[PDB]
Structures are given as C-alpha cells and as structure tokens.
C-alpha cells in the first residue's frame, strides 16, 4: 500500500491548489477561506465564489443556523451550477455539507473546468485534451515532450516553454534547461509578478514529489490560457505585427524606388548609345573639332552620372536584400535585366560604344588634318615650280633671234605669267586656313604664302624690265636715248607710279620730279603754280603723265646739258684764255662760293690754277 | 686792169666801214663824220675822236683858219697816237691834211689795231694772226674753215659761229647754212639789237662783191672781240658754269645719301643673317613655338623694309646715273660690292638663311609633336595594359587551392595594381601638356585618361569585394553571417565611407542608418539626442565606427527579427486560433490601416480570411 502514500500526498497538494484557486476570485470582493474542504460546510463560500464568477445575484442565508438552512444554500448554489453545462446527478447538498473530500474536490474541479477551460472542447476532444493540444501546438520547437500533466510538468521546462512562446520579453529562454528549482522558481515569480498569476502551485512540493497531481497543474495552466488569451495578449501581439509589416512596408518603398530609378537608368543609357552611334565624322576640321568637343561634355558630363547611378542602385539592391536576409524572408530577384550584374553590363556598353566613336573621330581628325595641310601644299608647290621656270626662261640669254621677235616671245611668255595672279589669293586663303586649324609644322611643303607673292612679284617686274631695254635697243637708231639710259627712266618712273597703271598722277608726278630736285622753285609762299603751267606743258592734253611724255621731257631736259666742248668754252670766257682757273676770276665771274668749293674740290690745280683738260677729256 | 676794179670797189667799202666805225665812238659826245676822206682834214674831228678813246684833254682849235691850223692840229693829235705803240714815221701832218686816200685809210687802220685788238699780240704772232687764231679756236666744232679774212667770210656762216659759239640763246644754229643774204642779214641784226653793235658792215656789198674787203672784215670782229670778252659776257660766263656746278653738287649729294644708306642696308642685312644663323631649333614645344613666332615678326617687319630699301636704292642709283648720262659726263660707278647687283645678292642671301631657318624649324615643330603624343601614348598603353592583366585575375575563378591562400593570394596581388595609383598622376600631367599644345588626334593611342582612371579604380573595387566575400566564406562557421550577406553589409559601408579609411565619421554613419530608415525618431525638434547615445552604443569607444561594430549592430538587429514559425505565433493569437485573418481582428488588435492594406495587398484570401501559410512555408 505504498501507492496510498501517493495518494495522500496529491490530495494535501490538491487541496492546497484548489484552496488558492476559489480565494483568488474571492479577493475581488474582500472574501476569503482557509480550506476548501471545510469552509464550504456552511455554503455561504461556494455561493458567493459562484456570484463574482457568474455575475449573478443569489442572497443566500450568511449565517445558517440549522444543517437544513446549510443544505438550503447549497440547493440555491447547485441550481446555479447545473444550469451551466454541468453534471451533478451524483452529488447531493448533504455531502458537500458534511465536507466529504472527493466529492467536494471533484465539484471544484467541475467548476474550474467551466469557467477557465471549457473553451477548449472541440467535437471529439475533451476540456482536458483540448488544452493539451493547446499545449502541445506552442511547444513545437521546445526540447520539452508534453505527454502528460504529471511527467512532463515536472521538469518545469514546459512552463518556461508557455512564457517565453508568448512573451519571449520576460524569461529568456536559453538560460533554462538544468535546475528544476531555479526554472520553477522563475516561472512562477514572472507569472506573480507581471502576468498577475498568484503562485497556485507551491515550488518545493512538485520537485520533492515523484509525478505531481494532475489536476493541480491544470489549474495553473488554464488560468496560464487565460492571460495569455487576454485582450492585453492580443494587443501586444498587434503592435508585434505591426513592426514587423511596417519594415516590409518600408522596403515595399525601397523596391519601388529602385525599380522607378533601375528602369530610368537603363533607358537613359540606351539613349546615348542612339546618339553616339548615331554621329558620322565630319571631313570638315571646324565640323571635327566640334564632334569630339561633343563627347567631352559627355564624358566631364552625364558619363559620370551613369557610373554613379549604377553603382548607388548595386548599393540599394544590396541594402534591400540585407534587410530581407535579416527578416527570415526570401531574397529580392529584380526583374529579368534589371540586376545590377545586369545594370553594369549596360554601363559597359555605353563606354564601348565611347570608344568606339572616339576612336573613329580620331582617325577624322588625323585625316582631316591631313586634308588641310595639303589644300595649302600641293597648289604652291605646282606655284613655286611655275614661276621659276619662268624666271628661269627670263634668265636665259642664249637666244640668237632677232630682237623684235625676242621681245614678241617676251611679251607672250610674260602673259602666262601674268595669268598665276589670280592663283596667288586662293592659296593665300588656303593657308590662312591652316592656321585657323591651328596647324604650326607643314612637313609637305617649305615653301610660304609670301615666298609665293614676292617671287611672282619679282619674276614679273623682270619680264617688264627685259622688254623694255630690249625695246630701247630697237628704238636707239630712231630716238637718241642710249637702251641703257631709258631703263633709268622706266625704272623711275614705274617706281612713283603708285598704282601699276604706268601713267603718272598730277600728284604722282610732283613727287617723281622733286625727288630728283628738277623744281628748283620751293618754299616762297607755296609757289608751285609754275608746276601747274609745266604740268600742263608735260601733258600736252593730257590728264596723266604719258611714259612718252615723261621721257620726252628727260630728252628735253638733257639737251639743255652742254656738250664737254661746250663745256671748255664757259671756262676760256671765265679764265680769258689761261687753263688755268683763278678763285679771283670765278669771285670776279660772281659764282657761289659753294660753286667755288667744289671747283677745288673736283679739280687737279696747276700753280695758281685749276686744270679742266681731264674734263673736258671724253 | 680788171685787178683794177676790184681795188677801187674795195676803197668804197673800206672807207664806209672805216666812216662807220669813227663815228661809233664820236656818237658818244653828240659829234659825227661823213666821210674819213674828207672830214679828217681838218684835224678837229680826229683830235675828238681821239680824245674820247684815249681818254684824255687835247684843246685843239675848233675852227682852223689857215693850213698851218689845221697842221698845227694834226702835230698834237699825231704826238698821242706816237705815244702809243705805233709806228708813224712814214706819214707826215701835211697829206693827211691834203686828203690823200691810201695814207688816211692806212692811219685809221693802225689806230683801230691799238684801240681795238691790239691785246692779241702774242711774241710771234701779228694783231691780225693773233685774232685769227681766236676765230679759228671758237669755230672747231663748226663746218666752216677760217683761212683768210675776205674768202671764209663770205660765206657768213663764220659771222654765225662765233655768235652761237659765245652765246647760243640768240641765234640758234642749225637754221643756218644756206643762204648768203639770210644767215648775214640775221647775224648783223642780232649784234645790231641785242648786242649794241652797230651794223659796221653792209650786208649786200659783200654778198655782190667776188671778195669781200679785208680790213673792213677785221673792223668788226675786233668790234665783236670786245663786245664777247665784255665785263657781262664774263658774268653771263658766270652764271651757265653756276648752273652745271651746281646741278653736279646736288648730285654729290645724291650720291652721298646713297652710299651711307647702302651700306646701312648691307650691314642690316648682315646682322640679320647671323641672328639666323645663330638660332638653335628647341626640343620643348612652347618655346619652338616661340621661335616660328620669331620668324614671323621678321618676314612681317624687317623682312619687308629691306626689300623696300634695296628697290628705292637700285632707284636712286638708277636715278643719278641718268642725270650724269644727261650731264654728257662720265657714269656713277659705285664702290665694289655696293651696286645694287651686288645689293641684290644679299637680300637673294637673307632670303636663303630665312628658308633654310624655318625649314629647320618646320622639322623641330614637327618631331616635337610627336614626342609630346607619345609622352602620354607609352605609358597610358603600358598602363591601360597592366590594370587589364590584374583585372583578368580576379576575373579568373579556375583556382583549385585552399581559400586562405586564394585570400592570401589575392591580397598580395591587390599591392601590386594599387602602387600603380602613383603613375595615374603623371599620366593626368601627359595628357594635360597634349592639350595645351593644341593637339585633338593621338594616333597612337586610343585610350583616354579618365579611361584609365575609371578601370583602374573599378578592379581595385573588384579586389576589395573578393577579398571580403572570400574571406566570410572562411568566416561563416565562425559567425553565423550568410558570406552573402556580409558583402552586403560591405557594399553598403564602403559606399557611404566618403574618404577611403574603412571606418565611418558620426556624421557618416548617421546617413547610412538614415538611408535604411532604421532611425525611426525623426524631426520632434530635432531629436536625435537618442542617437548621440545610440552612435555610443554601437562605438564602444570608439570615436569612429568599426566595420565589425557596424557588422556587431546589424546581426543585433537582425536577432531582433522573428523566425517564420514565431510569426506564426503572432498571427495564431491574433486570430486566436483560425488561419484566416479577418480585418476585424487586426482593427480588434489594434493595428494601423496601412498594416491591414499590406496584409490584404501581401497575402492570398481564404472565405472571409487571409490564410499566412505561405509565409511559413520555408
Ligand atoms: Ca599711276
Ligand atoms: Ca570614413
């Protein structure tokens, strides 16, 4: 009879629970018993329990005189039970009077049953196992078995297991799962202390014992449910979801932000691919430059942009897939060629379709370079090697023609010559072109624009000298102008000739002539009327200086030159028949005495004289 | 006796002319004769005569009365002309007296030879002779022959020459030749009117006669000597030598200017040609630059003036050697090496230094371009080909070997690419001189600085990225990070990190956190003091943030974050039991509408619910 010992032991723990149950509600209205199985005798207890439990009014006798007035108080409380889904045909108000033990505790477990855990019953499954589901389900990934309301409670580990599924803010769980005393202890302070669960269940006598009472556990549980189950539970649940959805949310706003952003990136770099190959390299240089100034502003410009954009995006896909990895949740995959593996490739590829266009610019540039060196080169090449071979055919006097047909071929050969004039302002052009271009080195040709114009410039002034004296030596015989002399005359007269017209302006010709000092009439109150009359008397119409004219006048000029003799004649009437001239005869002749000066100057002196026999020698 | 005729027509002549000519000078004192056969006989006239050619006081009686008067007159008028030198020892006053013909003609003629030519004598040579070698020597250029004083002055184109030979502006001389009467006519008129020589001679008894008489010829040319050898014909002299001194003088002054400006114009050119010479075609673009420069300054200035300087010289030499082919006199030659042939030369020569100058300079320009093409071309293409070779490495995943040693590896081949770096600047530098020199076309690369810039920075971020994911591979067991997922945590850090140091500032940190929103405190007048605390919390210290304190926090908040099987939990008791969530329920539990939008947006619908297990599902 051992196991009468046990037994026993359960009921002292069970009425210990039992009694720690029914005065808990009884708190609430000031009310309190010591034990369940002999302060329900008088019936006021159990009726009064029933009314804060039930929340209806019974007004039974507080102080019953007689064992029929006890027996009467149960009746009105056993008519409160049974109307709630109870059964109580075995037990009769004499016996709960009489405070029978089994009977007594087996109507406190009724009660309990109705008012803590009833709920549970699912077709097919009593209060008792419904809770043990209810059990079971919240213990999944526990190391705890739940088979039982004795063994598997012992441990105490379960009752962790019930706190920390629930609310894992107040006993954590890892440091659980050695000491029975200690995880005990703990539950039952957190559930007294937070849940507002009064310590039921006593911790010494469920770790002394080998398998506590059943029904005592059950108890604590169902109160455990009831907390648990509270409107409080349900509210600290929804703040729970709340933080969790509200982080999806906000990443909901991170993949949308990318997905707008990704999408924009890959259109805009698409974009300029369009445009870069798109361009055509120009052959014009100004053209040229301004393609690849093009791609510069695209490379100091968006370029920049699109490698900063890709890689803020590879950031914020990163960022994004952290967050889901830290929430237990599945990976973002962005849409099929939105990746960011995707997005670089893109970046890529504007940068070789960069490369691409620079390159071919390049190669235009070089050309077009080229193109323009040679625009100036090659025609003054043909222009340098043209005017020197006639230079060369002026040069040339191995001829053995007759005159007037050198001077025919003269003129003819000069024609052609002349006709280059007009090449001369293109090439001008052509390289003051390369030096817009910016071009410092020729390598095509040494040869310059102004080398070009004065070689012509001279060649032609050289053809129009060799006609000219060649014409003179034809016309000696007929006008008596030594060839040699009229060169003099066109050379002069050509070089005052200010436009290349050879004819002399009015002010043209004053110039030419006072260069000379012909007009020995100056200052005097500008006096140059007489210029007005030798104008007019040069030109015989003429309105310009004809080159006859001027050359007729020269002749005119020179013949009023004394010949040697002639010459020897003024000096005899000077000296009066001595050669030799006296200072006094020319003072006494009334000469200058600068004339004087130079007569000394000039002339080898004979004694008291001056010879004038070498001058006159001819 | 024809011989007879002659010599009476003669006498006729003789004492017409000889009449003529004493009253020439008697006219000078109101006085005058009509026959020197006649009027001389009575002694007066000649005495007067006398007197005023001698210049001295004879008082003679005016009136002789008898023969001893008119005797006695002629002893003191004989007695002046003994004085002088004359012979009179054969003539007596007695005939002269009587009238006697030969006698009177023959002591008229004496007078005249001492009155009038008696200065020709010359030890040898008569009055006569003496004044025919004066005619002789004044008529050598004319076709005339002077023999005798009757026969060549018949002729009168003697009378002609020795008035055009003295003074040509009076009767000019080529319109004469023909006619005897004409050439005589004009000649007698000429001395007549512009000479104040009386018309001595007749001009039709000369021309009539077979020879004209010899004395009475002579009469008129010593008459002519006097009038030429004048005082005035002197100053005449005087001024026609003036004339042609002068014009000589002013010519010196030509031919001085010229030298001193020729030879300045052969030194010029002189120092320009050694300056030429001289010049050293530079390595450095800036400065051949500056050296092409140079030339230009010369071809547009000096260049240009010494062109212009040698044309007006080959002018004026040009120029004064007409003048003194006009003169009759000999050419100007001018001093060896300074005719402007030679003058010529030497610009031919400056003009030779110019082109092989800039020629030499062309090539300098020309090879120092492509240098400085090819100062940034080798080592970009050097470079652009190292960043590739390591970009292939951590490219490369063939490897077999242990991933500590793959770590170590690559870590040891991260120096290596990021000691380059340091050669990126100067590269910078290379290309930046390329533009400066106005280059737009390589040729010889294609590659570009930011290229390489941007390559080089994107494989050294490919390293760094490796190397962490490689080595939280090697990490997992360890820390329980997805490797995944540090990169992600890496990606995010290293972005936000503004300078490289791998560590974030307190400003810095904030927008990372900022960014994923995980500072949920926002504006409240700017309470953000909780982070002050937070930045703390996460920096032990550690002023800075730690990539492995950073990496501490987010598996902290990570931790925060409920499995799927607690989510369940969550949901169960918000439910109370049923998969399928009402909106009721969640509006029960308190949760915001956005919460309850997501849920019904985020989870597939079951009857009157939203059923969560595919959330679960894992
Ligand atoms: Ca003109
Ligand atoms: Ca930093």
Redesign the interface.
């Known amino acids: 009879m051992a196991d009468s010992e046990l037994v026993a032991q359960w009921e002292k723990v069970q009425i210990k629970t039992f009694t720690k149950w029914v005065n808990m509600h009884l708190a609430k209205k000031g009310r309190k018993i010591n034990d369940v199985t002999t302060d329900f005798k008088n019936g006021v207890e159990l009726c009064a329990l029933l009314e804060i439990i039930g929340e209806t009014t019974i007004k039974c006798v507080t102080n019953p005189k007689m064992r029929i007035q006890m027996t009467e108080n149960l009746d009105k409380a056993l008519r409160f039970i049974q109307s709630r889904d109870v059964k109580l045909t075995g037990i009769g108000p004499t016996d709960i009077v009489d405070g029978n033990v089994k009977l007594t505790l087996g109507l406190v477990w009724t009660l309990i049953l109705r008012f803590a855990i009833s709920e549970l019953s699912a077709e097919g499954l009593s209060a008792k196992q419904g809770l043990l589901l209810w059990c079971q389900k ?1 213990c ?2 526990y190391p705890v078995k739940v088979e039982n309301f004795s063994e598997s409670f012992k441990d105490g580990k379960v009752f962790c297991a019930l706190i920390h ?2 609310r894992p803010d107040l006993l954590d769980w890892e440091t659980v799962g050695e000491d029975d005393r200690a995880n005990l202890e703990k539950a039952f302070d957190v559930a007294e202390k937070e849940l507002g669960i009064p310590k039921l269940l006593d911790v010494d006598d469920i770790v002394n014992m080998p398998r506590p009472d059943e029904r005592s556990v059950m108890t604590y549980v169902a109160a455990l449910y009831k907390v ?2 509270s409107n409080d ?3 600290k ?6 933080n ?3 982080l ?3 990443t ?1 706003g991170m993949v949308h932000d990318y997905e707008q952003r990704a999408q924009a990136l890959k259109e805009n770099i698409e974009a300029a691919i369009n445009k870069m190959n798109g361009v055509e390299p120009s052959d014009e240089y100004h053209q040229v ?1 301004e393609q ?1 100034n093009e791609t510069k502003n695209y ?1 100091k410009g968006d370029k920049r942009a699109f ?1 900063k954009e890709q ?2 995006l ?2 914020l896909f ?2 994004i ?3 889901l ?4 949740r599945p990976v973002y995959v962005a849409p099929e060629g939105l990746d960011p593996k995707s997005l670089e490739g893109y970046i890529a590829n504007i940068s070789e379709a960069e ?1 691409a266009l ?2 071919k610019l ?1 190669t235009a ?2 050309n077009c ?1 080229i193109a323009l060196r040679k625009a100036f080169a090659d025609p003054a090449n043909a222009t340098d090697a043209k005017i020197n071979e006639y230079r060369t055919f002026v040069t040339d006097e191995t001829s053995e023609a007759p005159l007037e047909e050198q001077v025919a071929t003269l003129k003819a050969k000069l024609e052609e010559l002349k006709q280059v004039e007009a090449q001369l302002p293109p090439i001008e052009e052509a390289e003051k072109a390369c030096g817009d271009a ?1 071009i ?4 095509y040709t ?1 040869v ?1 624009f ?2 070009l114009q ?1 070689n012509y410039e001279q060649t032609v002034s050289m053809f129009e000298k060799k006609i000219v004296y060649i014409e003179a030596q034809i016309n000696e015989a007929s006008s008596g102008v ?1 060839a ?2 009229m ?3 066109k ?2 007269f050509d ?1 005052f000739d200010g436009n290349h017209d050879g004819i002399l302006d009015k002010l043209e010709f004053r110039s030419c002539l006072s ?3 012909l007009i020995d009439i100056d200052f005097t109150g500008g006096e140059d009327a007489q210029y007005d009359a030798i104008y007019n008397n040069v030109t015989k119409g003429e309105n310009g200086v004809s080159f006859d004219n001027y050359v007729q006048y ?1 002749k005119e ?2 013949d009023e ?5 002639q ?1 020897n ?3 005899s ?2 000296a ?1 028949g001595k050669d030799s001239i006296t200072e006094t005869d ?1 003072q ?5 005495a ?2 004087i000066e ?2 000394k100057a ?1 002339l080898p002196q004979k004694g008291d004289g001056y010879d004038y026999a070498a001058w006159v020698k ?1």
Not at 440 to 443: S, T
Not at 588 to 592: C, D, E, F, R
């Open positions: 919240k999944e990934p599924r629930h648990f189950s539970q349900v509210e649940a929804g703040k729970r979801a709340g969790f959805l509200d999806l949310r906000a909901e430059k690849i490379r490698i890689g803020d590879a950031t990163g960022q897939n952290s967050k990895r830290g929430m237990k490369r620079r390159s390049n540039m070089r370079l910016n410092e080195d020729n390598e040494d310059s102004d080398d004065f030594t040699e002399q060169q003099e005359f050379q002069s070089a260069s000379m000092g020269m000029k020179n030159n004394p010949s040697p003799e010459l004649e003024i000096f009437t000077i009066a020319m006494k002749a009334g000469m200058s600068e004339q130079y007569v000039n001819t």
